[PDB]
Ligand binder design. Structure first.
Ligand SMILES: [C][C]([C][C]/[C]=C(\[C])[C][C]/[C]=C(/[C])[C][C][C]=C([C])[C])[C][C]OP([O])(=O)OP([O])([O])=O[C]1O[C]([C][O])[C](O[C]2O[C]([C][O])[C]([O])[C]([O])[C]2[N]C([C])=O)[C]([O])[C]1[N]C([C])=O
Ligand SMILES: *[C@@H]1O[C@H](CO)[C@@H](O[C@@H]2O[C@H](CO)[C@@H](O)[C@H](O)[C@H]2NC(C)=O)[C@H](O)[C@H]1NC(C)=O
Lengths: 43, 110, 117, 26, 96, 149, 37, 701
């Protein structure tokens, strides 16, 4: 008897090249938000 | 004519908007453009990977909505409705919400 | 035409359509196209029945009586729908749809004839 | 006679969850 | 199936373009930083807020969930204290 | 196409149609909704839904040494089983008790005659006391050991 | 260990007392002049 | 005069602390009846699955638990525990356990689970008072806390040892509502963020999160129809929706359901509508009214067509999943009974009767309308939500008995409001309590009896309140204090005799069988066997695979020869059946035999199995001489009644009589060709048979 198990969450592929646009959006949002905070307070 | 109406609507809006409010509108336009562009990519290239597309797209909407809430709370015209809330308190809450949004999208981005 | 003769004529046309629909109910439901043909017949029955009901109302209560959405219009529509169910369930969608399309134009016709005058 | 011990009634069995209906016949 | 790399790169660069537009509107509309001051609270608060956003990237590459929270709690506490002191000073100035 | 509909009306008298919103069709008043909810509450507590799915008889039958078929109203010893008649009778009591308080509250309003005030109070207490007390009797019959220790 | 009989009496006593106290709270609350000020 | 000299602010605070403190004590204490009367053990069938998971998580760590795959259940398919479970209950137990050990307080994990539920009941009491206080006043809140503490309906699933999801689900739900009410009322983003975070916690704890995600959109929609929509509503609802949706998705079990399922579409639709409504108002204010009509009509025509087309396309294409079977039934009652046998089979899915309502709630049922009447009389934005919460709970509680628990919280709060209003109004009628401001002239000479009227009204209300306590105590002691695993019987002398057969069989299997043995049983007992026997099982309570269960049903219902063929294919080693004839235990397999028949025939392979075949020609299910031939020769009948014919159950009845069916078995003497008797309990409650191997000589068995 041998048990076969599904893949663990860690084992899944990361940094998929096709998903780069999705990656860019999230990083872009943070940078824009911070810059807005700086200008808005001291306008 | 509708086209004439749009011209006057811009004309009144520019004069009647304080600079600080205008800055919000410019920021919102940037957020909307990024979100729409991502949506077009998904329907042209395909859903896969669903995890990445959904996480990125949701982040744009969360940022856009959060900015709008600040836009309304600070406005003097609506001051009576949000009784007891100073501008400083509203801004502090807005940053706190943004921090949570970035963290949760971060888990599901990959 | 005379109101009294008009009431009888509308009743006769509606009655004839209803009797024919029941007689050929089995054939009409056999095929989708025939069921659609039933939709046209049911709407026609609704139009004639509505005309008869208004004519009767005018004679009993005096000329110029105005038909309302309820219960005069609703009752006539309900009777037509009930006949549609007997032949087949499918018509109730098509039989209803034709009746509504006729109703809008009939109201447009009535407004021009009566309101303008 | 063989053994002793008569069960009581569970006046409130119904609340139990994920259990099969023991009264279909009735 | 996966899309061609060339299209994936093209969109990735394109997503950057709105950020350039955002600066263009602000510069043309009249952006100013005249109100800025060098008070210690003001500098500390911005630095803490920026660091917390930075920590997100570090979590992406190396940290796990438990580690990220442990650092985040300390960084949040300092940022909150700086923000509270800074806001009170700004409120007094506005109400003057 | 419009001409085709005109063809019958050339001989027939066209009906005069006024496509206006009916006068009676108004947005329900706040009190109106509350009344509608109360009647629904009567049915739901009555077990109307239980009756539809399980389809129990209105009344069952029993026997004794003297034999013969007693009708039964209460389903003895099973809490989750009921007859049609029993469920409605119990439900009505629950609604009545609630109303008794509301009428009592209205009776307390100022500027009411001496006769009116006394009469209203009597009804309020009768509904409340009978509704609550009767309900205990109904359960006591259904479960003989109720509150017994 | 306490027997079930003791636990049952204890539960009844606390509940009855607590409800009466809530009634007493209603008394003072209306009786409060500053509440109407 | 000592009390008088204290300031009124001191008096109100002191009473407030005393009332709340006592209520917490009562809530915890009342749940200990079972633990005192019986041993400190886990109750019911479902909790054991939670107990096994909780131990694994604490010992192994969160990361291992997250990826845990269990091969000991649903053999040979297996089950993925990590992605098919709700982690909320397990995480809470583990976290407290670590903290107590950290301080060198060494407590058993089993104790932590057993006593987890009573503690939360006390926490729920505090939350109730604050939520009620917001709606009306402090006085109502104190009443609500008292009612919630001893309500029998809540007690049924929160008694000590009831380690079930329901214990924590209610507390999370109330907290989320409390945050939501403050978010709308204040209109502050900070409250909105807190509400979303509470919502996420509930989503992990229970699978009933769906109820909240539909009720909240419904409340906002009603406000829009009634014209009460304001900027505060827009900020509170819209902010919560975005954070709540993303947070819920993190849970592995939920996955992508929020965006793809038809269950969650209602929240999405309302969110889109709010944006349209807000934008239109902004345009109207800026624009000239005469022009605004022209733009308003043109915009509606273009936008409405586009929106309608998109919605129709999504439903028709099937990108959005249709409603799940479980939820479809809750709405349409008939669907489950006619289409899905498995859902109908469960004994907590039946419709509710009137007796159930009174038994669980008693006085509250009388007071529920009164609370509704006052809320309708005084309409407020916060009040509107509570009305929506009530009127829906009533509908969904009749359909299913299990949902009663959801009903209990709303019932207590609303009933309290009614009692509070009545007490305040008459009590101030009693002038002796307050002279206050009075005018002797124009005092309403239609009034002779002020002192008497108030005194009677208050006294009667007190009488009802005290009775409510007595009824709640008696029901909990007599109904909810019984452990399922241990059965209590009365001896001939009237002594209390305990039957421990259920555990005894499990222990026998634990040490007396090969470790790799596979045991076959009905799905009801899957959790219990795995936790205590530590042996592999074929079916489990979760019933994630219908076809697997149906195949099991066919074997039991079929003849002896056919059953053997199926069993060999699945490598079954032992079969366990529960028989209650000797002891009068009603919930035996034979009563459940019919469900097995229907389930077995549901699948394509089970078409040969017809329910009517097992009945007498007259339509009767009987096990006596007149019983159907197929029934007497089925596998289940032989197993239960093997060698039982010669046993004298009663002195007054002939041998081979079955006490629970009150009938004598028709077939008394028979032999088991393919099964052998391995072990039987002292009272015969549990019978174990061993599967015989093939014939050494190849002869047909
Ligand atoms: C029922 C509940 C819920 C609540 C909710 C509500 C009431 C709401 C409603 C709705 C709505 C929408 C409303 C609104 C209105 C409008 C809009 C108009 C909950 C329940 O819970 P649960 O968790 O489920 O419990 P239990 O039972 O224990 O569970 C178990 O069991 C079940 C059965 O029953 C199962 O199921 C299953 O699942 C699965 C998944 O995996 C599937 O596959 C299958 O099929 C099924 N089966 C059946 C028979 O159904 C489940 O699962 C379980 N659980 C767990 C966790 O596992
Ligand atoms: C329950 O059964 C499992 C299945 O065998 C037992 O696991 C064994 O544990 C022993 C002692 O640690 C190990 O030597 C074996 O290798 C384990 N076997 C497997 C297949 O994992 C487990 O010990 C039992 N649980 C108890 C006794 O509480």
């Amino acid at each position: 008897q041998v048990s076969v198990r599904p893949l663990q969450h860690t084992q899944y592929e990361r940094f998929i090249p096709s998903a780069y646009p999705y990656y860019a959006s999230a990083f872009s949002m943070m940078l824009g938000l911070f810059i807005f905070s700086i200008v808005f307070l001291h306008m | 004519s509708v086209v004439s109406v749009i011209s006057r609507f811009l004309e009144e809006y520019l004069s009647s908007t304080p600079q600080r409010l205008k800055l919000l509108d410019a920021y919102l336009l940037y957020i909307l453009l990024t979100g729409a562009l991502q949506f077009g990519y998904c329907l042209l290239v395909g859903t896969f990977p669903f995890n990445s597309f959904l996480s990125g797209f949701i982040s744009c909407v969360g940022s856009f909505i959060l900015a709008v809430c600040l836009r309304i709370q600070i406005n003097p015209q609506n001051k009576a409705d949000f009784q007891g809330i100073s501008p400083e308190r509203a801004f502090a809450d807005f940053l706190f919400a943004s921090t949570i949004l970035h963290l949760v999208v971060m888990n599901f981005v990959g | 035409v005379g109101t009294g003769t008009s009431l009888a004529l509308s009743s006769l046309l509606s009655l004839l359509l209803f009797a024919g629909m029941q007689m050929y109910s089995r054939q009409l439901a056999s095929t989708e196209w025939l069921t659609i043909q039933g939709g046209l017949l049911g709407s026609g029955l609704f139009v004639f029945s509505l005309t008869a009901f208004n004519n009767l109302e005018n004679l009993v209560f005096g000329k110029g009586f105005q038909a309302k959405i309820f219960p005069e219009i609703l009752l006539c529509l309900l009777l037509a729908l009930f006949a549609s169910g007997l032949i087949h369930r499918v018509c109730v969608t098509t039989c209803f749809i034709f009746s509504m399309v006729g109703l809008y134009y009939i109201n447009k016709i009535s407004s021009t004839l009566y309101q303008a005058a | 006679v063989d053994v002793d011990g008569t069960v009581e009634e569970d006046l409130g069995k119904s609340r139990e969850g994920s259990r099969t209906d023991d009264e279909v016949v009735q | 199936k996966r899309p061609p790399t060339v299209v994936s790169n093209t969109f990735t660069a394109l997503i950057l373009s709105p950020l350039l537009l955002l600066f263009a509107l602000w510069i043309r509309i009249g952006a100013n930083v005249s109100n800025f001051t060098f008070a210690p609270s003001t500098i500390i608060f911005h630095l803490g807020h920026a660091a917390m956003l930075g920590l997100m990237y570090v979590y992406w590459t190396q940290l796990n969930m438990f580690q990220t929270l442990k650092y985040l709690a300390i960084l949040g506490s300092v940022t909150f204290l700086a923000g509270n002191r800074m806001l009170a000073q700004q409120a007094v100035k506005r109400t003057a | 196409m419009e001409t085709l509909y005109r063809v019958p009306f050339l001989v027939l008298e066209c009906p005069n149609l006024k496509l206006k919103k009916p006068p009676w069709l108004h947005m329900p008043s706040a009190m109106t909704v509350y009344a509608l909810v109360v009647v629904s509450y009567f049915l739901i507590t009555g077990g109307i839904i239980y009756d539809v799915i399980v389809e129990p008889p209105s009344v069952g039958s029993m026997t004794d040494e003297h034999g013969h078929q007693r009708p039964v109203a209460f389903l003895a010893y099973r809490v989750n089983g009921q007859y049609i008649m029993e469920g409605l009778a119990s439900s009505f009591l629950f609604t009545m008790g609630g109303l008794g308080f509301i009428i009592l509250d209205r009776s307390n309003a100022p500027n009411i005659p001496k006769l009116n005030r006394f009469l209203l109070l009597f009804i309020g207490f009768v509904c409340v006391l009978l509704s609550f007390f009767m309900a205990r009797v109904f359960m006591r019959m259904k479960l003989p050991g109720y509150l017994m220790g | 260990m306490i027997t079930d009989v003791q636990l049952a009496i204890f539960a009844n006593m606390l509940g009855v007392s607590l409800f009466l106290l809530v009634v007493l709270y209603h008394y003072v609350a209306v009786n409060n002049p500053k509440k109407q000020e | 005069f000592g009390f008088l000299r204290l300031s009124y602010e001191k008096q109100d605070t002191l009473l407030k602390l005393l009332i709340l403190s006592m209520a917490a004590v009562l809530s915890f204490s009342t749940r200990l009846f079972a633990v005192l009367r019986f041993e400190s053990v886990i109750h019911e069938f479902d909790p054991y699955f939670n107990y096994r998971t909780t131990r694994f998580l604490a010992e192994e760590g969160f990361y291992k638990f997250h990826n845990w795959f269990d091969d000991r259940a649903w053999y040979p398919l297996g089950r993925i525990i990590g992605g098919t479970i709700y982690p909320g209950l397990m995480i809470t137990s583990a976290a407290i356990y670590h903290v107590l050990h950290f301080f060198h307080i060494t407590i058993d994990i089993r104790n932590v689970c057993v006593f987890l539920a009573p503690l939360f009941s006390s926490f729920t009491t505090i939350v109730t008072y604050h939520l009620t206080k917001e709606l009306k006043d402090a006085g109502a809140g104190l009443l609500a806390a008292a009612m919630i503490a001893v309500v029998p309906g809540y007690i049924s699933r929160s008694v000590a040892g009831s380690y079930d999801n329901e214990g924590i689900a209610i507390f999370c739900m109330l907290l989320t509502y409390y945050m939501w009410i403050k978010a709308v009322k204040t209109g502050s983003i900070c409250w909105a963020a807190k509400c979303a975070l509470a919502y996420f916690y509930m989503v992990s704890s229970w699978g009933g999160y769906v109820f909240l995600i539909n009720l909240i959109p419904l409340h906002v929609l009603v406000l829009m129809l009634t014209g009460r929509f304001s900027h505060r509503i827009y900020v509170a609802y819209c902010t919560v929706y975005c954070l709540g949706t993303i947070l819920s998705m993190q849970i592995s079990f939920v996955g992508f359901q929020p965006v793809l399922s038809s269950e969650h579409m209602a929240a999405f639709g309302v969110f889109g509508l709010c944006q349209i409504h807000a934008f239109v108002d902004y345009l109207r204010s800026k624009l000239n009214p005469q022009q605004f009509e022209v733009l308003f009509r043109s915009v509606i025509s273009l936008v409405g067509f586009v929106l309608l087309t998109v919605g129709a396309l999504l439903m028709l294409t099937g990108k959005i999943s249709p409603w799940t079977g479980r939820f479809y039934s809750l709405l349409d009652p008939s669907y489950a009974k006619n289409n899905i046998p498995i859902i109908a089979s469960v004994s907590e899915h039946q419709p509710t009767t009137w007796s159930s309502y009174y038994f669980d709630l008693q006085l509250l049922v009388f007071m529920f309308p009164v609370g509704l009447y006052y809320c309708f009389s005084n309409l407020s934005d916060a009040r509107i939500f509570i009305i929506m919460y009530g009127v829906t709970s009533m509908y969904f509680s009749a359909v299913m008995v299990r949902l009663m628990l959801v009903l209990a919280p709303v019932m207590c709060i609303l009933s309290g409001i009614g009692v509070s209003q009545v007490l305040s109004t008459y009590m101030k009628n009693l002038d002796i309590s307050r002279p206050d401001k009075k005018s002797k002239k124009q005092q309403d000479s239609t009034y002779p009896i002020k002192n008497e009227v108030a005194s009677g009204m208050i006294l009667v209300m007190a009488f009802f309140l005290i009775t409510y306590t007595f009824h709640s105590t008696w029901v909990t002691s007599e109904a909810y204090s019984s452990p399922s695993i241990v059965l209590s019987a009365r001896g001939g002398d009237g002594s209390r005799i305990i039957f421990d057969d259920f555990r005894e069989a499990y222990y026998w299997l634990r040490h007396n069988t090969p470790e790799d043995a596979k045991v076959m049983s009905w799905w009801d007992y899957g959790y219990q066997i795995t936790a205590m026997a530590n042996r592999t099982i074929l079916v489990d309570n979760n019933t994630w695979n219908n076809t697997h269960i149906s195949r099991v049903g066919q074997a039991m219902a079929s003849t002896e020869e056919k059953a053997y063929e199926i069993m060999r294919e699945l490598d079954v080693s032992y079969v366990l059946v529960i028989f209650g004839g000797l002891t009068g235990y009603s919930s035996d397999d034979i009563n459940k035999f019919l469900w097995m028949v229907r389930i077995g025939g549901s699948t394509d392979t089970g078409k040969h199995i017809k329910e009517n075949d097992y009945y007498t020609p007259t339509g009767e299910f009987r096990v006596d001489r007149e019983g159907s031939p197929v029934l007497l020769n089925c596998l289940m009948y032989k197993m239960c009644y093997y060698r039982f014919g010669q046993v004298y159950t009663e002195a007054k009845r002939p041998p081979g009589f079955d006490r629970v069916r009150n009938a004598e078995i028709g077939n008394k003497d028979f032999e088991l060709d393919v099964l052998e008797e391995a072990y039987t309990t002292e009272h015969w409650l549990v019978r174990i048979y061993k599967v015989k191997d093939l014939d050494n000589r190849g002869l047909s068995r």
